[PDB]
Design a protein around this ligand. Sequence first.
Ligand SMILES: [Cs+]
Ligand SMILES: [Cs+]
Lengths: 87, 87, 87, 87
Amino acid sequence: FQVLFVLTILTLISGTIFYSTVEGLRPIDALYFSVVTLTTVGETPPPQTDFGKIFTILYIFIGIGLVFGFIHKLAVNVQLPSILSNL
Amino acid sequence: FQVLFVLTILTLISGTIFYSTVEGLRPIDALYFSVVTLTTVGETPPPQTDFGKIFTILYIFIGIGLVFGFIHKLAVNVQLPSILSNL
Amino acid sequence: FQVLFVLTILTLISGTIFYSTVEGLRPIDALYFSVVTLTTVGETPPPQTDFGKIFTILYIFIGIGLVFGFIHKLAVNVQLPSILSNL
Amino acid sequence: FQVLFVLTILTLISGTIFYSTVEGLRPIDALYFSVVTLTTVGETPPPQTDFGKIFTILYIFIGIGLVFGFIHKLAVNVQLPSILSNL
Ligand SMILES: [Cs+]
Ligand SMILES: [Cs+]
Protein backbone atom coordinates (compact mmCIF):
# COMPACT_ATOMS: atom_id res chain seq x y z
CA PHE A 1 0.00 0.00 0.00
CA GLN A 2 2.88 2.28 0.99
CA VAL A 3 4.91 1.14 -2.07
CA LEU A 4 2.18 1.75 -4.76
CA PHE A 5 1.50 5.12 -3.04
CA VAL A 6 5.15 6.04 -3.56
CA LEU A 7 5.20 5.01 -7.20
CA THR A 8 1.93 6.90 -7.84
CA ILE A 9 3.17 10.09 -6.20
CA LEU A 10 6.42 9.93 -8.16
CA THR A 11 4.47 9.36 -11.41
CA LEU A 12 2.30 12.42 -10.59
CA ILE A 13 5.22 14.70 -9.78
CA SER A 14 6.90 13.75 -13.08
CA GLY A 15 3.72 14.76 -14.84
CA THR A 16 3.39 17.99 -12.89
CA ILE A 17 7.00 19.05 -13.84
CA PHE A 18 6.49 17.95 -17.44
CA TYR A 19 3.29 19.76 -18.19
CA SER A 20 4.22 22.86 -16.10
CA THR A 21 7.31 23.37 -18.21
CA VAL A 22 6.48 22.09 -21.76
CA GLU A 23 2.71 22.92 -21.79
CA GLY A 24 3.23 26.02 -19.67
CA LEU A 25 0.59 25.13 -17.10
CA ARG A 26 0.54 26.36 -13.51
CA PRO A 27 1.57 23.46 -11.29
CA ILE A 28 -1.98 22.89 -9.91
CA ASP A 29 -3.26 22.57 -13.45
CA ALA A 30 -0.40 20.25 -14.57
CA LEU A 31 -1.20 17.99 -11.59
CA TYR A 32 -4.90 18.05 -12.36
CA PHE A 33 -4.13 17.19 -16.01
CA SER A 34 -1.85 14.38 -14.93
CA VAL A 35 -4.42 12.93 -12.56
CA VAL A 36 -7.49 13.10 -14.86
CA THR A 37 -5.41 11.57 -17.62
CA LEU A 38 -3.98 8.55 -15.76
CA THR A 39 -7.44 7.84 -14.27
CA THR A 40 -8.89 8.13 -17.85
CA VAL A 41 -11.42 10.73 -16.74
CA GLY A 42 -9.99 13.28 -19.13
CA GLU A 43 -12.21 16.40 -18.72
CA THR A 44 -9.56 18.68 -20.25
CA PRO A 45 -8.48 19.98 -23.64
CA PRO A 46 -5.61 18.01 -25.18
CA PRO A 47 -1.97 19.09 -24.95
CA GLN A 48 -1.12 21.61 -27.64
CA THR A 49 2.53 20.78 -28.45
CA ASP A 50 3.81 17.77 -30.30
CA PHE A 51 6.20 17.03 -27.48
CA GLY A 52 3.19 17.14 -25.04
CA LYS A 53 1.29 14.62 -27.17
CA ILE A 54 4.07 12.15 -27.40
CA PHE A 55 4.82 12.30 -23.77
CA THR A 56 1.13 11.99 -22.93
CA ILE A 57 0.97 8.86 -25.05
CA LEU A 58 3.92 7.19 -23.17
CA TYR A 59 2.72 8.46 -19.81
CA ILE A 60 -0.69 6.79 -20.18
CA PHE A 61 0.80 3.36 -21.16
CA ILE A 62 3.21 3.27 -18.22
CA GLY A 63 1.11 5.22 -15.70
CA ILE A 64 -2.40 3.83 -15.95
CA GLY A 65 -1.50 0.35 -14.77
CA LEU A 66 0.13 1.77 -11.67
CA VAL A 67 -2.51 4.37 -10.80
CA PHE A 68 -5.24 1.73 -11.01
CA GLY A 69 -3.32 -0.82 -8.95
CA PHE A 70 -3.10 1.96 -6.36
CA ILE A 71 -6.78 2.72 -6.45
CA HIS A 72 -7.77 -0.91 -5.92
CA LYS A 73 -5.87 -1.00 -2.67
CA LEU A 74 -7.05 2.58 -1.67
CA ALA A 75 -10.78 1.70 -1.76
CA VAL A 76 -10.49 -2.11 -1.54
CA ASN A 77 -7.70 -2.44 1.03
CA VAL A 78 -8.29 0.61 3.32
CA GLN A 79 -11.88 1.94 2.93
CA LEU A 80 -13.30 -1.60 2.91
CA PRO A 81 -12.67 -2.80 6.47
CA SER A 82 -13.13 0.76 7.70
CA ILE A 83 -16.63 0.96 6.17
CA LEU A 84 -17.55 -2.77 6.20
CA SER A 85 -16.77 -3.36 9.87
CA ASN A 86 -18.96 -0.49 11.11
CA LEU A 87 -21.64 -2.69 9.42
CA PHE B 1 -25.78 -4.44 -2.61
CA GLN B 2 -27.72 -2.21 -0.23
CA VAL B 3 -24.48 -1.16 1.54
CA LEU B 4 -22.48 -0.14 -1.63
CA PHE B 5 -25.64 1.69 -2.81
CA VAL B 6 -25.59 3.72 0.41
CA LEU B 7 -21.92 4.58 0.16
CA THR B 8 -22.34 5.56 -3.52
CA ILE B 9 -25.33 7.81 -2.84
CA LEU B 10 -23.50 9.48 0.03
CA THR B 11 -20.41 10.01 -2.18
CA LEU B 12 -22.67 11.58 -4.86
CA ILE B 13 -24.45 13.92 -2.47
CA SER B 14 -21.09 15.14 -1.12
CA GLY B 15 -20.11 15.94 -4.68
CA THR B 16 -23.41 17.64 -5.45
CA ILE B 17 -23.05 19.96 -2.38
CA PHE B 18 -19.38 20.60 -3.14
CA TYR B 19 -19.67 21.58 -6.75
CA SER B 20 -23.00 23.45 -6.27
CA THR B 21 -21.38 25.73 -3.74
CA VAL B 22 -17.67 26.10 -4.76
CA GLU B 23 -18.11 25.77 -8.58
CA GLY B 24 -21.47 27.52 -8.49
CA LEU B 25 -23.30 24.83 -10.44
CA ARG B 26 -27.04 24.16 -10.24
CA PRO B 27 -27.52 20.96 -8.25
CA ILE B 28 -28.49 18.86 -11.32
CA ASP B 29 -25.27 19.91 -13.00
CA ALA B 30 -23.11 19.27 -9.87
CA LEU B 31 -24.60 15.76 -9.67
CA TYR B 32 -24.01 15.15 -13.36
CA PHE B 33 -20.40 16.36 -12.96
CA SER B 34 -19.92 14.13 -9.95
CA VAL B 35 -21.31 11.08 -11.73
CA VAL B 36 -19.43 11.47 -15.07
CA THR B 37 -16.24 12.05 -13.12
CA LEU B 38 -16.36 9.04 -10.77
CA THR B 39 -17.35 6.80 -13.70
CA THR B 40 -14.39 8.32 -15.69
CA VAL B 41 -16.68 9.28 -18.57
CA GLY B 42 -15.84 12.93 -18.14
CA GLU B 43 -17.77 14.74 -20.94
CA THR B 44 -17.53 18.11 -19.16
CA PRO B 45 -15.21 21.09 -18.92
CA PRO B 46 -12.85 20.96 -15.93
CA PRO B 47 -13.53 22.76 -12.65
CA GLN B 48 -12.43 26.37 -12.82
CA THR B 49 -11.27 27.07 -9.24
CA ASP B 50 -8.15 25.77 -7.58
CA PHE B 51 -10.20 24.48 -4.69
CA GLY B 52 -12.42 22.59 -7.25
CA LYS B 53 -9.35 20.96 -8.80
CA ILE B 54 -7.89 19.76 -5.59
CA PHE B 55 -11.12 18.38 -4.36
CA THR B 56 -11.74 16.72 -7.71
CA ILE B 57 -8.35 15.05 -7.46
CA LEU B 58 -9.12 13.58 -3.95
CA TYR B 59 -12.69 12.73 -4.91
CA ILE B 60 -11.60 10.56 -7.84
CA PHE B 61 -9.02 8.56 -5.76
CA ILE B 62 -11.50 7.76 -2.99
CA GLY B 63 -14.69 7.63 -5.09
CA ILE B 64 -13.84 5.62 -8.17
CA GLY B 65 -13.13 2.39 -6.31
CA LEU B 66 -16.50 2.58 -4.62
CA VAL B 67 -18.58 3.61 -7.64
CA PHE B 68 -17.13 0.75 -9.68
CA GLY B 69 -17.64 -1.83 -6.93
CA PHE B 70 -21.26 -0.66 -6.99
CA ILE B 71 -21.60 -1.00 -10.71
CA HIS B 72 -20.29 -4.56 -10.74
CA LYS B 73 -23.05 -5.64 -8.41
CA LEU B 74 -25.70 -3.44 -10.23
CA ALA B 75 -25.24 -5.16 -13.63
CA VAL B 76 -23.55 -8.39 -12.43
CA ASN B 77 -25.58 -9.10 -9.28
CA VAL B 78 -29.09 -7.78 -10.22
CA GLN B 79 -29.46 -7.48 -14.04
CA LEU B 80 -27.71 -10.83 -14.58
CA PRO B 81 -30.20 -13.33 -13.18
CA SER B 82 -33.04 -11.06 -14.27
CA ILE B 83 -31.85 -11.14 -17.90
CA LEU B 84 -30.05 -14.53 -17.91
CA SER B 85 -32.94 -16.53 -16.48
CA ASN B 86 -35.47 -15.32 -19.07
CA LEU B 87 -32.95 -17.11 -21.38
CA PHE C 1 -21.68 -14.06 -26.73
CA GLN C 2 -24.89 -13.84 -28.77
CA VAL C 3 -26.89 -12.90 -25.63
CA LEU C 4 -24.62 -10.00 -24.42
CA PHE C 5 -24.54 -8.78 -28.06
CA VAL C 6 -28.33 -8.58 -28.01
CA LEU C 7 -28.49 -6.73 -24.72
CA THR C 8 -25.78 -4.29 -25.90
CA ILE C 9 -27.52 -3.56 -29.19
CA LEU C 10 -30.82 -3.00 -27.40
CA THR C 11 -29.11 -0.66 -24.88
CA LEU C 12 -27.59 1.29 -27.82
CA ILE C 13 -30.85 1.63 -29.72
CA SER C 14 -32.57 2.94 -26.58
CA GLY C 15 -29.86 5.57 -26.34
CA THR C 16 -30.08 6.44 -30.03
CA ILE C 17 -33.89 7.04 -29.77
CA PHE C 18 -33.49 8.94 -26.51
CA TYR C 19 -30.84 11.39 -27.55
CA SER C 20 -32.23 11.81 -31.11
CA THR C 21 -35.54 12.97 -29.71
CA VAL C 22 -34.78 14.79 -26.39
CA GLU C 23 -31.30 16.19 -27.30
CA GLY C 24 -32.28 16.68 -30.92
CA LEU C 25 -29.29 14.84 -32.34
CA ARG C 26 -29.18 13.15 -35.74
CA PRO C 27 -29.34 9.41 -35.17
CA ILE C 28 -25.65 8.82 -36.07
CA ASP C 29 -24.66 11.38 -33.46
CA ALA C 30 -27.03 9.97 -30.78
CA LEU C 31 -25.50 6.53 -31.36
CA TYR C 32 -21.98 7.91 -31.19
CA PHE C 33 -22.88 9.73 -27.95
CA SER C 34 -24.38 6.58 -26.52
CA VAL C 35 -21.35 4.49 -27.41
CA VAL C 36 -18.61 6.90 -26.19
CA THR C 37 -20.55 7.35 -22.97
CA LEU C 38 -21.11 3.69 -22.03
CA THR C 39 -17.47 2.91 -22.90
CA THR C 40 -16.45 5.95 -20.71
CA VAL C 41 -14.45 7.47 -23.55
CA GLY C 42 -16.61 10.57 -23.53
CA GLU C 43 -15.10 12.87 -26.22
CA THR C 44 -18.31 14.92 -26.51
CA PRO C 45 -19.95 17.94 -24.95
CA PRO C 46 -22.46 17.07 -22.21
CA PRO C 47 -26.21 16.85 -22.80
CA GLN C 48 -27.83 20.26 -22.60
CA THR C 49 -31.27 19.47 -21.12
CA ASP C 50 -32.03 18.46 -17.57
CA PHE C 51 -33.93 15.46 -18.81
CA GLY C 52 -30.80 14.46 -20.89
CA LYS C 53 -28.60 14.68 -17.79
CA ILE C 54 -30.79 12.57 -15.63
CA PHE C 55 -31.21 9.94 -18.23
CA THR C 56 -27.49 9.95 -18.94
CA ILE C 57 -26.84 9.37 -15.25
CA LEU C 58 -29.18 6.27 -15.13
CA TYR C 59 -27.97 5.02 -18.50
CA ILE C 60 -24.34 4.90 -17.38
CA PHE C 61 -25.12 2.95 -14.13
CA ILE C 62 -27.18 0.29 -15.92
CA GLY C 63 -25.33 0.29 -19.26
CA ILE C 64 -21.64 0.29 -18.43
CA GLY C 65 -21.65 -3.09 -16.72
CA LEU C 66 -23.26 -4.66 -19.75
CA VAL C 67 -21.18 -2.94 -22.44
CA PHE C 68 -17.97 -3.98 -20.68
CA GLY C 69 -19.10 -7.58 -20.16
CA PHE C 70 -19.68 -7.57 -23.92
CA ILE C 71 -16.28 -6.20 -24.72
CA HIS C 72 -14.48 -8.81 -22.63
CA LYS C 73 -16.00 -11.57 -24.69
CA LEU C 74 -15.55 -9.60 -28.02
CA ALA C 75 -11.74 -9.32 -27.68
CA VAL C 76 -11.17 -12.11 -25.12
CA ASN C 77 -13.57 -14.76 -26.44
CA VAL C 78 -13.46 -14.18 -30.26
CA GLN C 79 -10.29 -12.22 -31.25
CA LEU C 80 -8.14 -14.30 -28.87
CA PRO C 81 -8.16 -17.74 -30.47
CA SER C 82 -8.38 -16.11 -33.89
CA ILE C 83 -5.16 -14.13 -33.27
CA LEU C 84 -3.46 -16.47 -30.75
CA SER C 85 -3.75 -19.62 -32.85
CA ASN C 86 -2.14 -18.09 -35.94
CA LEU C 87 0.79 -17.80 -33.45
CA PHE D 1 4.10 -9.61 -24.12
CA GLN D 2 5.72 -9.35 -27.56
CA VAL D 3 2.50 -10.59 -29.23
CA LEU D 4 0.04 -8.11 -27.55
CA PHE D 5 2.61 -5.35 -28.29
CA VAL D 6 2.42 -6.26 -31.98
CA LEU D 7 -1.37 -6.30 -32.08
CA THR D 8 -1.51 -2.95 -30.22
CA ILE D 9 0.97 -1.27 -32.55
CA LEU D 10 -0.91 -2.56 -35.59
CA THR D 11 -4.22 -1.31 -34.11
CA LEU D 12 -2.62 2.13 -33.54
CA ILE D 13 -1.17 2.41 -37.04
CA SER D 14 -4.58 1.55 -38.53
CA GLY D 15 -6.04 4.39 -36.51
CA THR D 16 -3.27 6.80 -37.46
CA ILE D 17 -3.84 6.12 -41.23
CA PHE D 18 -7.62 6.29 -40.80
CA TYR D 19 -7.88 9.56 -38.99
CA SER D 20 -5.01 11.21 -40.95
CA THR D 21 -6.85 10.61 -44.19
CA VAL D 22 -10.63 10.78 -43.39
CA GLU D 23 -10.48 13.34 -40.51
CA GLY D 24 -7.58 15.19 -42.11
CA LEU D 25 -5.39 15.14 -39.01
CA ARG D 26 -1.60 15.36 -39.02
CA PRO D 27 -0.26 11.90 -38.21
CA ILE D 28 0.87 12.86 -34.66
CA ASP D 29 -2.65 14.05 -33.92
CA ALA D 30 -4.32 10.95 -35.47
CA LEU D 31 -2.09 8.76 -33.28
CA TYR D 32 -2.87 10.81 -30.20
CA PHE D 33 -6.60 10.56 -31.00
CA SER D 34 -6.31 6.83 -31.50
CA VAL D 35 -4.46 6.33 -28.23
CA VAL D 36 -6.68 8.53 -25.99
CA THR D 37 -9.72 6.86 -27.48
CA LEU D 38 -8.74 3.20 -27.02
CA THR D 39 -7.56 3.96 -23.46
CA THR D 40 -10.94 5.75 -22.87
CA VAL D 41 -9.19 8.92 -21.73
CA GLY D 42 -10.77 10.91 -24.52
CA GLU D 43 -9.54 14.52 -24.00
CA THR D 44 -10.34 15.49 -27.61
CA PRO D 45 -13.22 16.83 -29.66
CA PRO D 46 -15.21 14.12 -31.46
CA PRO D 47 -14.64 13.18 -35.10
CA GLN D 48 -16.52 15.50 -37.43
CA THR D 49 -17.47 13.19 -40.33
CA ASP D 50 -20.07 10.46 -40.30
CA PHE D 51 -17.53 8.00 -41.61
CA GLY D 52 -15.19 9.01 -38.68
CA LYS D 53 -17.96 8.34 -36.15
CA ILE D 54 -18.83 4.95 -37.45
CA PHE D 55 -15.28 3.86 -37.63
CA THR D 56 -14.61 5.23 -34.15
CA ILE D 57 -17.52 3.18 -32.85
CA LEU D 58 -16.13 -0.12 -34.35
CA TYR D 59 -12.57 0.76 -33.41
CA ILE D 60 -13.43 1.13 -29.71
CA PHE D 61 -15.30 -2.25 -29.53
CA ILE D 62 -12.47 -4.20 -31.15
CA GLY D 63 -9.54 -2.12 -29.87
CA ILE D 64 -10.21 -1.49 -26.20
CA GLY D 65 -10.02 -5.13 -25.17
CA LEU D 66 -6.63 -5.47 -26.80
CA VAL D 67 -5.11 -2.19 -25.60
CA PHE D 68 -6.08 -3.00 -22.01
CA GLY D 69 -4.78 -6.57 -22.18
CA PHE D 70 -1.52 -4.95 -23.30
CA ILE D 71 -1.45 -2.48 -20.47
CA HIS D 72 -1.96 -5.16 -17.82
CA LYS D 73 1.18 -6.92 -18.95
CA LEU D 74 3.11 -3.58 -19.46
CA ALA D 75 2.72 -2.45 -15.81
CA VAL D 76 1.89 -5.84 -14.23
CA ASN D 77 4.31 -8.10 -16.13
CA VAL D 78 7.34 -5.78 -16.72
CA GLN D 79 7.29 -2.80 -14.28
CA LEU D 80 6.27 -5.07 -11.37
CA PRO D 81 9.36 -7.21 -10.83
CA SER D 82 11.52 -4.29 -11.92
CA ILE D 83 10.06 -2.03 -9.20
CA LEU D 84 9.04 -4.71 -6.64
CA SER D 85 12.42 -6.45 -6.50
CA ASN D 86 14.37 -3.26 -5.76
CA LEU D 87 12.10 -3.38 -2.65
CS1 LIG E 1 -13.42 12.83 -21.71
CS1 LIG F 1 -13.03 9.85 -20.46
